[PDB]
Amino acid sequence: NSTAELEELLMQRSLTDPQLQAAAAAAADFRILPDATVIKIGGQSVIDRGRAAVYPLVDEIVAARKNHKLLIGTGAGTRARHLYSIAAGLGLPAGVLAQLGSSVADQNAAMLGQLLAKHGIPVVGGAGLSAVPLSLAEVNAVVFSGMPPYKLWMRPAAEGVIPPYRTDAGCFLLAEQFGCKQMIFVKDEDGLYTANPKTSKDATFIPRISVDEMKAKGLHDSILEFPVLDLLQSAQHVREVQVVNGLVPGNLTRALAGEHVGTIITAS
Amino acid sequence: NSTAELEELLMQRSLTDPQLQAAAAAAADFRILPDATVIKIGGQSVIDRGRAAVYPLVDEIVAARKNHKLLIGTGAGTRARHLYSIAAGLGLPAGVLAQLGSSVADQNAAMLGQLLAKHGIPVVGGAGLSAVPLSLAEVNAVVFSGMPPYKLWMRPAAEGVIPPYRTDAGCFLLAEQFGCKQMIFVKDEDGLYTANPKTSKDATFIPRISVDEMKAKGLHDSILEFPVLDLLQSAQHVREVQVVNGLVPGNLTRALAGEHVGTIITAS
Amino acid sequence: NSTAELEELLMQRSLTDPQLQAAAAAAADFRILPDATVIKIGGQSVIDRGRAAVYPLVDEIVAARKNHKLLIGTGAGTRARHLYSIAAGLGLPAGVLAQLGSSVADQNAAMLGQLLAKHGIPVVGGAGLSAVPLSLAEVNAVVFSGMPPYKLWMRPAAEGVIPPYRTDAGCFLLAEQFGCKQMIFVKDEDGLYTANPKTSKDATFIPRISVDEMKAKGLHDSILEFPVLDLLQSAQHVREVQVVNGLVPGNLTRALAGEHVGTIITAS
Amino acid sequence: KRPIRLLPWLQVVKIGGRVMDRGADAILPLVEELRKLLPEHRLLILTGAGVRARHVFSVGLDLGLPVGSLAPLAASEAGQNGHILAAMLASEGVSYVEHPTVADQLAIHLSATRAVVGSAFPPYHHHEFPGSRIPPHRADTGAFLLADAFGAAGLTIVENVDGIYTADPNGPDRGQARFLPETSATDLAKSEGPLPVDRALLDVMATARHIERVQVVNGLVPGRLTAALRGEHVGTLIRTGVRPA
Amino acid sequence: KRPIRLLPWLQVVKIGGRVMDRGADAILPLVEELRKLLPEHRLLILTGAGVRARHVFSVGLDLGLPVGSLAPLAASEAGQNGHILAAMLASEGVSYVEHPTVADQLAIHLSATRAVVGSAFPPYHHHEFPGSRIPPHRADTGAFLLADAFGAAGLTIVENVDGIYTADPNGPDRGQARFLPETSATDLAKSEGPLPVDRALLDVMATARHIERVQVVNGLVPGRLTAALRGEHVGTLIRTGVRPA
Amino acid sequence: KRPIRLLPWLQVVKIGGRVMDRGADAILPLVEELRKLLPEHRLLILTGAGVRARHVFSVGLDLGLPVGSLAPLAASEAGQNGHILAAMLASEGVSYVEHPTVADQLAIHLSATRAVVGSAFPPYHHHEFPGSRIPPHRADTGAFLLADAFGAAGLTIVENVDGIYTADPNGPDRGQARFLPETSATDLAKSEGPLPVDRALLDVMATARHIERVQVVNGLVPGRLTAALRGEHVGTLIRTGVRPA
Ligand SMILES: Nc1ncnc2c1ncn2[C@@H]1O[C@H](COP(=O)(O)OP(=O)(O)OP(=O)(O)O)[C@@H](O)[C@H]1O
Ligand SMILES: Nc1ncnc2c1ncn2[C@@H]1O[C@H](COP(=O)(O)OP(=O)(O)OP(=O)(O)O)[C@@H](O)[C@H]1O
Ligand SMILES: Nc1ncnc2c1ncn2[C@@H]1O[C@H](COP(=O)(O)OP(=O)(O)OP(=O)(O)O)[C@@H](O)[C@H]1O
Ligand SMILES: Nc1ncnc2c1ncn2[C@@H]1O[C@H](COP(=O)(O)OP(=O)(O)OP(=O)(O)O)[C@@H](O)[C@H]1O
Ligand SMILES: Nc1ncnc2c1ncn2[C@@H]1O[C@H](COP(=O)(O)OP(=O)(O)OP(=O)(O)O)[C@@H](O)[C@H]1O
Ligand SMILES: Nc1ncnc2c1ncn2[C@@H]1O[C@H](COP(=O)(O)OP(=O)(O)OP(=O)(O)O)[C@@H](O)[C@H]1O
Ligand SMILES: [Mg+2]
Ligand SMILES: [Mg+2]
Ligand SMILES: [Mg+2]
Ligand SMILES: [Mo]
Ligand SMILES: [Mo]
Ligand SMILES: [Mo]
Ligand SMILES: [Mo]
Ligand SMILES: [Mo]
Ligand SMILES: [Mo]
Ligand SMILES: [Mo]
Ligand SMILES: [Mo]
Ligand SMILES: [Mo]
Ligand SMILES: [Mo]
Ligand SMILES: [Mo]
Ligand SMILES: [Mo]
């Protein structure tokens, strides 16, 4: 291998050539924001619940950013399910639904952002994104909308028009892109169970599990969007994620401190 | 009342329903930027006068921001009156005049911004507005253009095509929206008098007055745009404003320090 | 002269009137960012070379910004020469080539920006430019793309369609506009020689030279874009520039420290 | 003189958000009626917000947010309704256009194509007026400000009811509710109960310069929008109080 | 039911970056052929990136940058190719339009004029998928996602070779390379060698909703693009696996 | 070869800011003349800045600001004049379009509608050249750079005087002022007095690739702009020094 053998392959072959693909795999690996943590705040599980859920999390973010650099992404929730229902009933394709859902995650980032403004924390992704480096350096946190940018170019699911990559996937990919040290999903249950705990009375709590074990137990599409599990197995930087209950006071803070609250899902 | 009784009204009635309007009035009241002060720098009374007026105010802003968070909005002035004259003579409506005047307040914010850049203070509202939280936290001040965004959707006055909501109203509404602690209009007279002091030789100075008293004395449209007085009476957060002479060295600084310079106009 | 004699000329004459031109020349001279240095990082001479060239310069920028405010502009390089070749062969005019080359300088600013993000340093010019004052105050450096904004309004050269104002000129004009104290071009040779050192074996090193002396020796278009020499002679603020080898470890740092490395080119 | 009319040939149609909320059963017939109208009129179609704005008001008010924060949050839902309606009309050359485009380039866009869709909410945003915790300048109000500023030939408001009644006809007093074929902005403004239009609409009607009447009609009955755009009386007429030149 | 077709009358044409890389000798005849096509079809012309993306991948990989950083860097080169091609067609009323405009206002733009040009790369950007160090969702993939989302009448891919072979026909095994007049996305996806199309294209074909076949043709032979847009078989047909309603 | 012409059928018209400064008495007849021209030509109408730029130069120079700060401040006034003129032509399908749109999508916009309006000032902004404290690349200069880059059929400059004289005809030497029916950029550039056109215009004429002559005419005399767009000699002709192919 060499800077030169890669450059010759890159000039002489299709990007599909297994030979070129293999030389590229050997390249150096730079992490852009290695000391940051990405947190997803659920739309339906947290923000839709209003101040009883949101105010304690705002207080935690404000306290936690003294010691931890944070990128806080928002989910969408019930207004996006309403939009998907209307648009699906009209026969609109997954790519149009994807744009509609983004607007809802944007609303939620605006609302969270207004509660955090007096602490110096901006909402970003609007005007820019190199908003992010300066913000992280000075106030240690930023708020972003969690939907991926695919919009009309969204790959559809095998069945149905609901966009398969939504705000769990958007936040995960950003953590992965930037080479962040940790990805925490904030939801409204303690973590993963053997069955939906809202719907099933004798579900058992699962502290740690791999993607393969989740699939073997039928949990592919339970507490996280199922494509996130596959993205996790391909990831270069973020090879596990943590799911925690945002409705328990202090839970986010304890996860940032290294406590094993919730469920840890590992790529292998 | 309850989070639940409001939500049922909000689902079941028109937003015009007096019943729903009354439940909403009982909601919590969050101030977004409670520790900041909004200052309007007059276009005709200050910036059009050039460096004899502007340079001492730049020095005050730089000194004052060490102890005071500032949002500094610009007025428009003589170039906007020129544009209004041309556009009115053509029969153009108030909404088109509103766009033209905004451009002039933008020019003035750019000029002020360039004098403040080496002190770290940005002009914002261009690319964003969540420019504001980060800027306020790090350099304690930002410059914005003072025209409201209504543009073509400007409500016209009862008579004539001059936009009734201009830069006094733009700055006031921002202070009110963000729940700021203080709103200071910087002009070229010591404060309110019983008559226009430029035009009337025996006008008397008025240190403090309510909107209702101003109306009873025919001062509805004297030193402030008259709709500002009505906006002030409806305000939730900013229930008085202060008018001071920007041409007196130190006057802005003393107003920020709590000194009763100029005129205080109260909602009631 | 007076604030008033200038204003009467400005009202009464064409901007072409020699009389008005002369009154304007007597105006005060404000420097917007007097304590900053503009650095151009060459596209072909540095960034195209990859990490052996770029990583040591990233480390220098990070160290140097502790004591020096920096605006770091990027050149374009081999991908822009490719684009110019394709577009020239089609008969496209200089103004269209100018837009194509800007995209390449943008790519290079993005790549450099990603290596600097974890140090707090943003890429700007994307969303704004009053990005610049806040960034300079808080992290002491920003990255921008070095192409001028002329695009389709580019003045063409006397012969051929290659845009004559490219990234040397873009960076120079910004330094000049903002009244910066120093302009450093980072290239891949020690400085100016009496002949192209890549092509000529007995070229002699030139430590210091004026524009007029460069022209008399046939060096008008050697290590800098030749219109930069003419811009330098008209400049109000930046009346000399320094050219240094970015491939020598520490060279940029030593130039920022006042060491006479490389070549100094003076307006007179 | 009153100001000139910028786009005297324009027809403006505002589609209530609660019509959109009914889904395909309401939208498909409305879209078919709009398709048939494209060769007859030059149309600016503006969508309201509907029930999702009520949800984001519930969340925002529970978080304590001021009226200048709620206003852009509601406006986003009017925007989404506009994107949905434009997508259904894409094959006819219709797209959604943003507010800046509406304000500055509507004439070139209606030269390019027969209709465009935009949001009815006005850009008051964080500069919304204080007093009520509910944003006053909403979709009816924004559509009328625009139509009147342009000096448009008309504004027609398309709702999920026949027009204005003396009481909410879906409300607890609906037995007492009498239909009003015709009324004035000034009479309405003096009444106290709920209405199917913004109360701010009645205020901006009092300062209007061009538009003399606005018809409110039922978009759930095919044909009424078509008839109203020809001046036929099939809902409630609102007289603005503009008197002719 | 499958979703509706938004722009059923649209034809999408993707122009490979390496066609553009050949300069005037390839571009001038392609531009003359496109000029003759404008009155026959409603065209969205999308450009790929070509060799400059390979250069910025070489630099970016040497700097260690992740796949979400390389993706927008390549996309910029597809953008530049689009500006070059649109400039050559300006006198015919054709311009380059940005992605947001493609996604939301393509219908009004193709009402205004007969064709527009945009970038074939999709906006995955910093949210590109991990796994390979080379961005997988490139120009073929982006053009197909778009064409299928719109329910377009077709997607034709214009390359610098006759179609797909059993081996790279410019490669060290070119003597063994057999031409494939017809094939399926599923058969292709099981093979291991290089192809003239993104491997991700075959994946998005498996989830496609509307487009049943995609033809790959040689843009260096005048007339082939014209013939392909009429459904004539002059390159390699790829069956997507969409089955009819 | 010289470069190709991008929009060979385009006519560019630059309207001086001081024409606009005269208000309705000058603007209404100019707008009526432009209305009559729309079916005859494909027009890019570009506005200059006029007296408000002189005011913002007075303020900016008193504050000490450099020439790269004054340039965008003047350009804003050219922009406002453009919005005013476009509003008067809205009912004819004309709107103001921003510089990025002019540079990249003018062809689709002149396919959509018969004329658009933009700012004549070029985007030199903070990268304006040093030397004079007054921005050199102003409205005449910007309009010519654009017209020549596009390879337009012509540029006509519409001013408040009959053309170029040997002295300012509104100046203290006006008794000595002789009218010049014809002249060259090179002769002009050697003279020292004031002119009704930017001195930078004469410089960009020396490097021009396509446009051979520019006519300066009096927009206060109805009919002169119409005659000039047909090549009739009714003002001062300026020969650029482009020689034919
Ligand atoms: N096996 C399981 N273990 C735990 N929770 C489960 C399981 N299966 C389903 N769930 C449900 O997953 C929900 C949380 O995921 P969900 O995506 O709904 O929240 P969210 O992140 O707020 O979504 P959005 O942000 O998209 O609105 C829980 O409320 C729980 O009821
Ligand atoms: N009764 C009064 N008391 C004091 N000042 C008055 C009174 N009536 C009129 N004025 C005039 O109000 C002027 C200040 O208001 P004005 O809005 O003109 O300034 P401004 O804020 O610079 O405006 P803009 O920013 O819109 O240019 C004073 O110069 C004064 O002459
Ligand atoms: N007389 C000379 N002295 C020194 N270098 C010279 C001379 N004449 C030509 N050069 C060449 O100038 C080159 C540097 O200028 P160049 O503009 O190519 O670099 P750059 O700033 O990277 O360009 P870009 O950023 O536009 O890619 C050197 O590599 C050197 O070979
Ligand atoms: N006096 C009245 N006459 C008619 N309808 C009334 C009256 N008072 C209340 N309403 C109610 O107004 C409802 C319309 O609700 P609203 O007007 O909020 O919806 P919309 O106009 O579709 O919403 P948006 O303003 O977001 O476009 C009708 O369904 C009716 O029940
Ligand atoms: N099985 C195959 N059949 C045909 N061509 C192949 C095959 N494998 C590799 N190739 C090569 O693919 C080349 C096309 O390269 P590529 O497909 O990257 O260019 P492009 O499509 O123009 O680029 P872009 O994707 O940026 O638009 C052909 O020139 C050919 O040499
Ligand atoms: N030699 C000359 N011949 C003709 N007019 C001259 C000459 N010298 C000066 N002028 C003056 O130039 C004036 C035009 O002013 P100017 O050219 O600045 O306005 P404009 O072109 O309308 O402005 P802008 O450049 O902002 O569009 C004429 O009114 C005339 O008085
Ligand atoms: Mg309503
Ligand atoms: Mg390919
Ligand atoms: Mg002039
Ligand atoms: Mo930021
Ligand atoms: Mo920022
Ligand atoms: Mo900022
Ligand atoms: Mo910032
Ligand atoms: Mo920034
Ligand atoms: Mo826009
Ligand atoms: Mo725009
Ligand atoms: Mo756009
Ligand atoms: Mo847009
Ligand atoms: Mo634009
Ligand atoms: Mo654009
Ligand atoms: Mo745009």
Curated annotation (Swiss-Prot), chains A, B, C:
Protein name as it appears in the record: Molybdenum storage protein subunit beta
GO CC terms, sorted: cytoplasm
Organism of this sequence: Azotobacter vinelandii (strain DJ / ATCC BAA-1303)
Subunit structure: Octamer consisting of 4 alpha and 4 beta chains.
Family matches, as InterPro entries: AceGlu_kinase-like_sf, Asp/Glu/Uridylate_kinase, MoSto_subunit_alpha/beta
Keywords: Cytoplasm, Metal-binding, Molybdenum, Storage protein
Induction description: Requires molybdenum.
Lineage: Bacteria, Pseudomonadati, Pseudomonadota, Gammaproteobacteria, Pseudomonadales
pH dependence comment: Optimum pH is 6.5 to 7.0. Above pH 7.1 molybdenum is released.
Function field: Intracellular storage of molybdenum. Binds polyoxomolybdates. Can bind at least 90 molybdenum atoms per protein molecule.
Gene name per UniProt: mosB
Family in the record: Belongs to the UMP kinase family. Highly divergent.
Compartment list: Cytoplasm
GO MF entries: molybdenum ion binding; nutrient reservoir activity
From Swiss-Prot, chains D, E, F:
Species for this entry: Azotobacter vinelandii (strain DJ / ATCC BAA-1303)
Record's subcellular location: Cytoplasm
Entry similarity comment: Belongs to the UMP kinase family. Highly divergent.
Transmembrane segments: none
Induction remark: Requires molybdenum.
Superkingdom classification of source: Bacteria
GO cellular component: cytoplasm
GO MF entry, a single one: nutrient reservoir activity
Subunit and interaction comment: Octamer consisting of 4 alpha and 4 beta chains.
Gene3D superfamilies per the UniProt record, alphabetical: Acetylglutamate kinase-like
This protein's name: Molybdenum storage protein subunit alpha
Keywords in alphabetical order: Cytoplasm, Metal-binding, Molybdenum, Storage protein
Oxidoreductase as UniProt keyword: no
Function: Intracellular storage of molybdenum. Binds polyoxomolybdates. Can bind at least 90 molybdenum atoms per protein molecule.
Pfam families assigned: AA_kinase (PF00696)
Alphabetical list of CDD domains matching this protein: AAK_UMPK-MosAB
pH dependence: Optimum pH is 6.5 to 7.0. Above pH 7.1 molybdenum is released.
